Symmetry: C3
Subunit: 397 residues, 3 copies
């Protein structure tokens, strides 16, 4: 039992390094906490964690495009719809269970139109080159930050258009498969930088009562949905140990607990499922890019608790529907999850000005929130893969 | 005669739908006209027509690039110059007849240097990625809106550079031919959205004497050049019925009567000539992208009438040359045709401040103006195709 | 001797034309010098030289990307490191000899932290499409002008990732080799415009004591390092006549003496080495893109003289290290070499406000400064090619 320890210290050496970086990140951060938290000084200390995010976000653009293009071309007309329906039924339910449990824990223990239009404006981009670095935000009208929604949508219909012309449109698919493979080699390179980054990402961010109880409500709620409810969903589908599957994607969850972005961690998550858990590439390039942008189970729970927590200052159907709708939401400027807090409160009738209270604790919750967002699509991949046994068998020979 | 009606209701079902959308567009627009024409309210009603333009303009960038690249590579050194000379002699004459007839109807019934330099600055782009979403406008110096001129020029010399290296540069040509085909599948998809868009595009834009007579001068002038002069040019070249050819490209003219942009309609025009009229792809990818940006017969007529109409408030050679030069013009910010009205009046000596009069009626004229711009290159394609009998025969085997 | 003159007037006809353009450029410039040097008037006269720079800079982006991608894929794991180590040992020494000689001639005859971070932020781009037209400059935070550093770095690791997957990643390499060849055909086209441009580039820029002696210090210093020291380095490696090699790349040096940018001239330099001097493409696509951005021997000499020249108004180790570090420097906004003058003086302790003195003469020195920057990598190519005899032999069959 205590003899086979060295065989684990050599195998998962980097997995121990990113864990030790989480340990040392708490160490160095609290060590430099008594010193002044000057804006420049903080941003200079949080620079090796900043460099990591630049390498990580540069890799997502040629990843999501090449993923969905080959992902839909390598699937039949009915096979693409089937795999999709299996994923959507999973996405909607996992964002509906997290909101239900999220509403229970808080009730037991404790322009809006222009947003709909901008999302629709972003689903159909006016320019593709622009979409690769610009999103639409009304009131000039194009804000900085890649329009992932417009790219995901275009990549799907373009990829499916290739999968409908076959022989002619094989060249482009063979181009996008080599490009997806090249960025999957680049992710193995940037993988080694992760410990040095995850350290300064959480070391630099810790140098920044009534909220005390709220913090535990969400944290425990996320543990019940993520480490209790979600593994039971996997066992109800595959009948395989999920706590061994989750172990394989640890390097992606540990980084999610640092980066706080399912986007920044999607290339590592892609490697953790294609290499460690050995999931079929045909479904990773399909489920993972969509899942990271739409399936946000960690967000659904946090949006529900925050809406009822501010009600203490002062019709659950108007809150449960909006919090599930906020999870699919990715409009305007890219943020930490506070970008959609105005929309979730206006539709019900709660005070919008009560947001400044939760922002002080939000940053530590964001790290746990992202872990569930990644765990949602990660476990979801196995569930969709197991449910698409016929579709994946027919593709070979 | 009245028995073969159902065989037309099933065949050209979408062509009847876009016509009925033009009918219902007049219906719903005038129905909601008594109500307040509030800025937000109008822009929200004109949203399903707005979404259409986003899908349409996203498709032009990978269309014009792939069109001209394969279009010049699939043609010999002399064959490219020949086909080109046939198109230029046609372009210059169709913009010279429309100005002559345009000058007759109005005379019978009724910095400028920095603009030349910006056009030249835009012919040779400083950066290609920039050119895909930015144009040059002096006084920071790069305005939003794709530099079509710089793309058309580069696409030609890049495509011809591939057509000069052959075997080596075949791979890229085979890539750009699959990409042109993929966006031609995407246009068939967006084709079905057109009725729902063309409805709200003209329904939302109708909720917005001396000019009364001017409006008819241009409208009748356009009918004489477009539906009388232009079909006679086609009959003088092909000796085939043009009123059957124009019927094939109806779905592109009906949309031009809505979108008001030969750019937005170029992907539909590409489908209407490659699928309905059965024109050779080798000349569509050649003539159509250039024709939509340079051959503007509807503009030449409107620029001539507007210049002499403002003279009523108060040397035809100084007006006839500038109005033909305004048609080739595509500099600065993309507009509705009023962007070049300062240039056409300064060179002759007419009052520039008299522009605010015609802008109120310009929007309805723009819809008819574009129809002639599309009809110019559409009929032009057949004429060039028929004139390049030897060049297209030698290319096979 | 005087009989074989016509055989040179027909062969190097364009090389005589660009030389005659340098002659006529001095002629027309001084002819129009008595007239008013109005801002607009100057910019309109310097327009045919302006058009040249637009064609030249549009060609660098698809050149450097395709160059380094095929350049590292067509080399073995150790072969890439070897060729690289040979180039780096050459780069660092040529920037160390130019600073040493630069420090001798001037001493015989006569936030800074935010700059380090921005360079590191630019080495790892956050977005690739952005990197193709945007650089990082702190205090919104992304300035206009292609991030060459981030492109050079990415192009290397992406190209090497293809060279590690072989057969799979051969398609993309065969794509990038056809694209590098296409822009090498486009450079032969733009080559003919060079005389008409180089004329108005130096004709328009000449219409714009204590500094008199400083001007000669640098000019003579550059001649000693470039036309005396550098050819001796080539003879110490190849044992071949360098004054015949330099003659082949004349059309690239003559243009450098006009454009004043090693970027703008890199496509011509690429043609002058691949066509005239007959250097192996395998090392041109390797050494040249890097060399133009990092190896700046003309800058190292000018940075050293300017730092000690301003000391006349008032520890050489603090000046010699910074001037060598300024040569590798390419951060923020693209300039004429004055962008790094604040950094080189703050680290030592010299007055930063004394910059406004040398800017009046800097423009004529810049033209000679660039010639050494181009001559550095041009001669460097031959030296690396000769030093990589084994690596280039093993690549064939
Ligand atoms: C809110 O945004 C999304 C985007 C994608 C999806 C689904 C998904 C996932 N996960 C992936 N990878 O592919 C497809 C999906 C479909 O349901 C539709 C499916 C599909 C089937 C058949 C034809 C198609 C043509 C174009 C695009 C998708 C198509 C592909 C769901 C919601
Ligand atoms: C104002 O802007 C334009 C742009 C294009 C054109 C003509 C055209 C049309 N329509 C198309 N499709 O191709 C060519 C044209 C030529 O006349 C030139 C022709 C050509 C022949 C031979 C070599 C070439 C090399 C580079 C570019 C074009 C070349 C191609 C005319 C005016
Ligand atoms: C300041 O910026 C630079 C960038 C490049 C270089 C060198 C160079 C030149 N000149 C070129 N063409 O390629 C390589 C170089 C290496 O030293 C490293 C070399 C290399 C070898 C092995 C594996 C690599 C993997 C990724 C990138 C480069 C790699 C390639 C030096 C400094
Ligand atoms: N931390 C969460 C959280 O990034 O998944 C989430 O972050 C805020 C947020 C809100 C709405 C949309 C997003 N979108 C992304 O970060 C994103 C996710 C994935 C991609 C993709 F490219 F597909 F990989 C691109 C972008 C993020 C939250 O805190 O609620
Ligand atoms: N409605 C006309 C009218 O778009 O063709 C015309 O619109 C204004 C105008 C003026 C100058 C240039 C343009 N250019 C375009 O709209 C355009 C046309 C074609 C393309 C292309 F990409 F090649 F398809 C790109 C842009 C438009 C007019 O009203 O005179
Ligand atoms: N004239 C010099 C001088 O352009 O090489 C130099 O110009 C200023 C300067 C300073 C720092 C960086 C640069 N970089 C470039 O011009 C540049 C060089 C090469 C490329 C590349 F793309 F690789 F070809 C891109 C950009 C220029 C100087 O005067 O010191």
């Amino acid at each position: 039992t205590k003899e086979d320890v060295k065989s684990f210290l050599r195998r998962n050496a980097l997995l121990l390094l990113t864990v030790l970086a989480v340990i040392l990140g708490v160490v160095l951060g609290f060590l430099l906490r008594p010193y002044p938290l000057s804006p420049r000084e903080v941003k200079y200390f949080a620079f090796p964690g900043e460099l990591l995010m630049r390498m990580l976000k540069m890799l997502i653009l040629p990843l999501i495009v090449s993923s969905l293009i080959t992902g839909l071309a390598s699937l039949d007309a009915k096979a693409s719809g089937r795999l999709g329906m299996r994923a959507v039924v999973y996405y909607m339910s996992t964002t509906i269970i997290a909101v239900v449990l999220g509403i229970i824990l808080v009730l037991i223990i404790h322009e809006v139109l222009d947003c709909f239009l901008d999302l629709a404006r972003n689903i159909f981009p006016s320019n593709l080159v622009s979409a690769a670095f610009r999103s639409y935000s009304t009131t000039g009208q194009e804000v900085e930050g890649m329009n992932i929604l417009g790219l995901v949508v275009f990549s799907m219909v373009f990829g499916f258009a290739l999968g409908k012309m076959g022989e002619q449109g094989q060249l482009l698919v063979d181009f996008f498969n080599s490009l997806n493979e090249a960025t999957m080699k680049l992710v193995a390179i940037i993988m080694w930088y992760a410990p040095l980054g995850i350290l300064f990402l959480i070391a630099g961010k810790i140098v920044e009562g009534q909220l005390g109880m709220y913090m535990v409500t969400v944290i425990v709620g996320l543990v019940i949905h993520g480490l209790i409810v979600l593994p039971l969903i996997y066992f109800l589908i595959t009948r395989k140990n999920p706590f061994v599957f989750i172990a394989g994607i640890l390097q992606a969850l540990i980084t999610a607990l640092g980066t706080s972005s399912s986007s920044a961690t999607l290339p590592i998550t892609f490697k953790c499922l294609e290499e460690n858990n050995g999931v079929d590439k045909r479904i990773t390039r399909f489920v993972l890019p969509v899942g990271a942008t739409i399936n946000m189970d960690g967000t659904a729970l946090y949006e529900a608790v925050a809406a009822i927590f501010i009600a203490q200052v002062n019709q659950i159907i108007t809150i449960s529907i909006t919090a599930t709708a906020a999870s699919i939401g990715a409009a305007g400027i890219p943020q930490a999850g506070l970008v959609t807090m105005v929309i979730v409160l206006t539709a019900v009738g709660l005070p919008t000005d009560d947001i400044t209270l939760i922002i002080a604790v939000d940053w530590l919750l964001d790290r746990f929130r992202t872990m569930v967002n990644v765990l949602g699509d990660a476990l979801g991949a196995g569930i969709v893969e197991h449910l698409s046994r016929k579709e994946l068998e027919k593709q070979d020979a």
